[PDB]
Design a protein around this ligand. Structure first.
Ligand SMILES: CC(=O)N[C@@H](CCC(=O)O)C(=O)O
Ligand SMILES: CC(=O)N[C@@H](CCC(=O)O)C(=O)O
Ligand SMILES: CC(=O)N[C@@H](CCC(=O)O)C(=O)O
Ligand SMILES: CC(=O)N[C@@H](CCC(=O)O)C(=O)O
Ligand SMILES: CC(=O)N[C@@H](CCC(=O)O)C(=O)O
Ligand SMILES: CC(=O)N[C@@H](CCC(=O)O)C(=O)O
Lengths: 290, 289, 289, 290, 289, 290
């Protein structure tokens, strides 16, 4: 209210280059962290999805739900663990993971976005075979370890996916997918978002995180980088904290696969999506090909 | 081992019904043993792929009462039913939605998708495809609040028909928001009839764990193969409580313009093919009267 | 220098209006200092590109009175105005058309096209997109022939909406043929209102070189931020002659079904963004009453 | 009636793999022999065409009419003969052949199919220049012999043809076609069916015949083959009865030209088309590439 | 040898009629000497290609009475006419259909297709494009059964207009099934008028072996260049029997909404171009009155 | 009136080969000279455009206006000149040129054509960025000379242009266009017509001129040529009168760029367009590739 009108006009006017770049384009947004627990942040995130939609941009939301899965497994008395930052997934764990991600977490996000209109539609790789999985192992200090029904996205039905977007819908993706034999696997949502971004030819991949950005020499807070190329970023990979490794592996996968830029942004900031896309604050970390 | 001239005649006799159903919507209420027995559920999924590959447009509406009850038990959530409806607190809704959409519908989508890229899971929440209005129930003349239980109110018919025209088979979990965004749990039988009417379906099929409608249960000589809605409405107060929702659904759909509704025996492998492409006279057919 | 959390809130607060305008036509009357000052005209063109890149469909109707007068002076053509309209001989029409379509509209098309392939210049002559009917004016009760001056008569709404659906921004020069093919000059304010009504625009924006409607000009305490068409029609005979065409245009558009018309201050950089995506309460909003 | 219901269900269920393979695909069916004279067989054939149509399959019927042509020529007192299994065709014979095939035989089939709906449409290569002919000779013991206005299908308008099928029609093709100079030639219907099958990218070519199938060492009835590759089948060609040579030359042409399989089936069997397509009886003879 | 400025004016004078017919259906009844003489039939086929390549949509309905009679003679089938219609036994129908569709229509399709991929032969049997209803005739007041003779009953207008929109020229043989599937022979003049009305044709052209309508046959001073349907209905009982079907066809078409029907001299090379693109006043034009 | 009807029929019938060649095709017509000053010729030209339109042909009109520009500059007291047959173009001259061409000359032609229906739409390269310019110099006896804001057509938006034609419109093109930096240049209308003809894949380019045709040895009136190949025509280029050089450079550009034929036709003849397209008078000069 206190802000003079000519200043508001200038903020709107400065969005124009970014509206032109994104009009009619796909933007994949990986949604997770505390941005899915704080109620103000969640409603702002959903409003930003409706914002993109009402500018003619095509958002695609890919969500996680690690803590919600862990909580439900505890409530049911199912003992489990993690190893490479991935959840060890028995058939029993997979059923719970799928039921929490698609039947609880994805449902809340669909309903939050739909307070703005008939846009959000929940999907998994199972639906219309929209994408498939291949079982993956993880490295426990150089040795490859079986962790059950954990997968990487293998193939994606680009055409059917873009058909949802053509109808004016915002796909909300829960990261489960069948392999070639129909066995459904749990996929880390960061890696799935990168696979979807590459497959759909997205103009950008946004990854919400609970951090200011990428630090090259953590915990040295002077090591924070606003922009980095994939060559330099791949060298940091052995050095990074285990919590960032999927975020970086996803950025590398997307940008090496042709997505013009991927962005690690602070999901703790209200309207972080609008800040990243329509402002030139230099905030977060931008990854480009190099 | 069957002579080929006999197989040919079985196939040839399907032709009148292929003609009647080609390009038409068929709403199938799926539940009971057809959903839990492994032979029956695989045959049901195959029958959905069969309809799809004849150019027929199936729409599956599924239930999941026992699965919900089992999960509530595991989580220690005690609840009641009233007038056949589950008393739905916000906690019960969350579990119901998570079981129906994240477990039961998921099993059917995967079973159907073994045949091709056809099944898509949806609730009324998705693209606001349908809405709910809160309903009460009258237990001994008094209207009773049972929480977040709804009836299907409005349906985006155009969007639904676009889905089936694109060759998808909607697998519908019966949850939907009201006008204020509050998600309600809807009884799946009532929902299937509402969807059948809204989409202008040519048939409503209601899978049940019984041979058909008995006027004098359990006497198998009281079984009715075909009945009009007028007579069936008179029979309704006399029927066993387990059949009431099935009959109320058939009545609503057929009075709402669906040419026929069918209570069919879901214990029979390929019950959908038997009902649609054969003139066995099995189950109970409901027509307008 | 502005904190990022403040920029975010400015952007977030545009969302209700992005929703209201997405896919809708907005007719903008462009003239006055917004058309001559180099900072304002570049911001106006950028605002048209802004609307286009939000999926909104702007349609610009421009004036050019002073530019016409200047060219007539250079060519030695002496003429008059009557009742605010230019006495239009065939010679005056040729100059008016050449200045409006071949000079003024050309500047705006090029300014907008610095942002992309959007602007297309058109008069009613092109594809017979709209027609004129000759009008007279009454000066002291007597109806006076003022030559080839017209009002917008019929509009090919379907063709115009096809243009904007294709992502083009029509830049309209206000000239049009009558039923016999004779091209008339149309006052741009009256034309913008006629186009807004014909296209079913969601808003009509009228850029003016004033803060808004004053009931007691020049006293800035008589400024009206919102008014209904009934009260505004009563105020009309009392207003300064410079505001009469602006008010008559708003009245015609809103009585003709446009949800709201806006007299906004074209002296303000980005006046279009301010009006549409901000709730500053600036200018004068006209609604049906 | 006596057949138990669970058996009927199983027969229907076993059609599913073949319905999936043929849904949305073209199937060319060459119709001829006694299946066009017996009234029960003819109505069953037409019902099978309506069956395919009402499963979302796209049948294209190509018909012959050798005996009907011969009968009309006899009625008119026009003397003629055969040489390489092909009719010697003067201009006078061509006019009669065209009038009988398109104006009599094709008309009966169109009306039989249309008892089931508005599907069948009669066409020749003349109509919309749907296909052209090139004059062909035949070999009389190693010497090439002119037999008049007899042709092979040269080019086919694949796009216009598929447009008829897109409108939900079942083309009924009489095998006459103009050459490049407009001279209409009579084309053997077996060879024309193979040319149409190749041109339309058909999934299968079905050839109705008055025989159990292909015998490799006729008349040894133990030489009947249910499946044979084109390499092996081409070697039999000099050995075969003159009545089968067009059936085999058509199968070879279609399958070498990319049609996944061609089938010689017994047109004496009611609903032979349904038996072949939706049953795994192993009946008839299937030809595949080898 | 003709001066080029004269050719230019002949071409320029076609423009009003190109405008009237562009995108419109023209139904042409083809028969008589225009169908048998080799110069005339080649010019007729070329004129059909001409219309097609102007964006006009010709639909040809052809006859073949003498050809049918000749084939029946060769086959030894004796038959009669009654009231101008052929007594149609199943045997006569088979020959009529085989001659009309398998011989006469084939010649025209091939002649037209020398100019491009345009002509397609169809009867009412094909895709059930039109149906017949059995008709009798009254010979001296008594209604007489004449076998499988029909009138055009219903027409799939949408399917026919799809054909011409795809750039095809339908060549129609006048045979069609009734409601029970029985194919009837239809008089081609009556059929052409029924098709013209059903397709909303802009013109019906009826080629005839005469200069036009004579009120006092054979006196060439009784020739009528234009007449309204009211007066022409009064003249009908007075006309020679050979003109009756032509006049009854024009009356039916124009009373059924076709703007004009034309009896034109098929003995004249390029009679179709002369009628449509020239204002010679030749033939007889029938308009509503 | 005096002309017998069978002669009129034959004139119409002889148009048929040319109607078949042009149906559904683009024809670019450069309109200029006295055909834009004589009132009978102008109305005949507009009628010929409506004629083409009502035969299903797609005309595209490109117009000039040299004398009208010169007249307006004189009225305004702006001194200017020519050098290589091109107008020396200051910013001041460009503004007048654009205002006269688009706001006066193009307007008269649009209204003349529209007396026949809703067909003509005026456009410049500025509109929807339909085409761009690159500044060009001219040769003054072997030395390259800057003549201000004069351009050649550089790129053309073929798709957007054909969209206007698909709606049934006749584009009337005024030859102004921006360069890559937005600076609008004046383009010689002959060269622009050739660029548009090449870009749209036109079947023919027609250039109205005030001459009988191309003379190879002017003024020898026996040197008039009805047809010439581009190889031979390029050799004449150093010899020709300065007034024909753009006409020839345009024909060469169009035909070398793939337009099947370009035609220099006498704009002094009423209905010259119909004479050229639908008559085989051999009039004018036809240019083909060689
Ligand atoms: C394989 C794996 O770890 N999946 C994640 C899915 C959700 C997320 O990525 O946050 C899990 O927690 O089970
Ligand atoms: C309101 C209500 O009881 N809904 C059902 C939904 C499942 C079903 O109908 O089978 C329930 O058990 O919760
Ligand atoms: C009739 C009339 O006065 N037209 C205006 C057009 C321009 C404008 O409205 O600004 C004129 O000054 O000629
Ligand atoms: C060339 C030739 O023999 N044509 C065949 C056509 C019909 C058929 O193949 O059965 C004929 O009998 O004349
Ligand atoms: C019923 C009838 O007489 N039909 C006509 C068809 C041909 C025509 O009209 O020229 C006939 O002679 O058989
Ligand atoms: C660069 C140039 O000479 N343009 C031309 C445009 C019109 C025409 O070609 O006739 C001019 O006269 O200015």
């Amino acid at each position: 209210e206190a802000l003079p009108t000519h200043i508001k006009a200038q903020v709107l006017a400065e969005a124009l280059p970014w509206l032109k770049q994104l009009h009619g384009k796909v933007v994949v947004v990986k949604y997770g962290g505390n941005a899915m627990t704080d109620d103000t942040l969640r409603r702002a995130f959903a409003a930003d999805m409706a914002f993109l939609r009402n500018c003619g941009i095509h958002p695609v939301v890919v969500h996680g739900g690690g803590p919600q899965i862990t909580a439900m497994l505890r409530r049911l008395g199912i003992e489990g663990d993690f190893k490479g930052g991935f959840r060890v997934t028995t058939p029993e764990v997979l059923d719970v993971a799928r039921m929490v991600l698609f039947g609880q977490v994805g449902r809340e996000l669909v309903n939050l976005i739909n307070a703005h209109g008939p846009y959000a539609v929940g999907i998994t790789g199972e639906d219309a075979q929209l994408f498939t999985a291949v079982r993956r192992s993880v490295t426990v200090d150089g040795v490859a370890t079986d962790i059950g029904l954990v997968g990487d996205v293998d193939q994606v039905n680009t055409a059917a996916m873009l058909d949802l977007v053509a109808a004016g819908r915002i796909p909300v993706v829960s990261t489960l997918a069948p392999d070639a034999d129909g066995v459904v696997h749990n996929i880390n949502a960061d890696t799935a978002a990168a696979a979807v971004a590459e497959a759909l030819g997205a103009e950008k991949l946004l990854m919400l995180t609970d951090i200011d950005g990428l630090y090259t020499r953590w915990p040295d807070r002077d090591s924070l980088v606003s922009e980095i190329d994939t060559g330099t970023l791949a060298q940091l990979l052995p050095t990074l904290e285990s919590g960032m490794v999927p975020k970086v592996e996803a950025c590398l996968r997307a940008v090496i696969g042709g997505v013009p830029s991927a962005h690690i942004i602070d999901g703790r900031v209200t309207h972080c999506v609008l800040v990243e896309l329509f402002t030139d604050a230099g905030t977060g970390t931008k990854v480009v090909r190099g």
